[PDB]
Amino acid sequence: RGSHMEDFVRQCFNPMIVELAEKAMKEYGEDPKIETNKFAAICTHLEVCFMYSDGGSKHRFEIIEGRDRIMAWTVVNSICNTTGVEKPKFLPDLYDYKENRFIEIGVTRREVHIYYLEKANKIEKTHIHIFSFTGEEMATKADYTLDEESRARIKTRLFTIRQEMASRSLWDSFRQSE
Numbered sequence: 001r002g003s004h005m006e007d008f009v010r011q012c013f014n015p016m017i018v019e020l021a022e023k024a025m026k027e028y029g030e031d032p033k034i035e036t037n038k039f040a041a042i043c044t045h046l047e048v049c050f051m052y053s054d055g056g057s058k059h060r061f062e063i064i065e066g067r068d069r070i071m072a073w074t075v076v077n078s079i080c081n082t083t084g085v086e087k088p089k090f091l092p093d094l095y096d097y098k099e100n101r102f103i104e105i106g107v108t109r110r111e112v113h114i115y116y117l118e119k120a121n122k123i124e125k126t127h128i129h130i131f132s133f134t135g136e137e138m139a140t141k142a143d144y145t146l147d148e149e150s151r152a153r154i155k156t157r158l159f160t161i162r163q164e165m166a167s168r169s170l171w172d173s174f175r176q177s178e
């Protein structure tokens with residue numbers, strides 16, 4: 001049963017992001033052919049994590065998301081044993097070598113206030129940065145890590161994705177599936 005959102009995801013995002021999203025869903029036991037809105041969300045958040053990592057200097061960010069669960073936990077062990085930072089209870093998405101903290105990036109369909117609460121509820125010392133499909137962002141202690149142009153590029157891409165879905169009538173189903 002091939003959905004329209006599955007075919008849109010493969011045309012909307014780059015193949016390396018699509019393949020990483022598939023492996024991430026097959027691990028943890030999910031099907032991109034069925035949980036197709038979730039398939040889109042993983043690709044979206046993966047692309048945001050990659051753009052974020054490209055916003056700083058060359059050696060600034062270590063990327064944790066998009067890895068196998070074991071090697072992602074391997075890299076944070078090495079980070080924490082090199083930096084002397086607390087090992088996070090849950091896997092974060094990035095590490096900032098310049099500001100010496102982990103980052104949990106969020107991409108949300110609701111308003112940025114509510115998700116940060118939920119994200120901070122499950123969190124203690126790692127930095128938190130939320131993006132929305134409506135252009136809003138919220139970061140821990142109002143420190144948005146990157147400069148304005150890099151974040152604005154991420155917001156523009158998010159709104160383009162929402163437009164492309166709406167143009168095919170997939171947005172309403174994607175908005176109310178979170």
Ligand SMILES: O=C(NCCOc1ccccc1)c1nc([C@@H]2CCCN2C(=O)COc2ccccc2F)[nH]c(=O)c1O
Pocket residue numbers: 024025027028030041042045046065091092093104105106107
């Ligand atoms: O890394 C994360 N989870 C570890 C892998 O879990 C998986 C579970 C099922 C399938 C694939 C992976 C992590 N999870 C989450 C959220 C809220 C907490 C649990 N959750 C998920 O299950 C959904 O995943 C995401 C939701 C939106 C954007 C990116 C995501 F990935 N949001 C994040 O931003 C995030 O980075």
Ligand SMILES: [Mn+2]
Pocket residue numbers: 065091092093
């Ligand atoms: Mn993650």
Ligand SMILES: [Mn+2]
Pocket residue numbers: 045093104105106
């Ligand atoms: Mn995240």
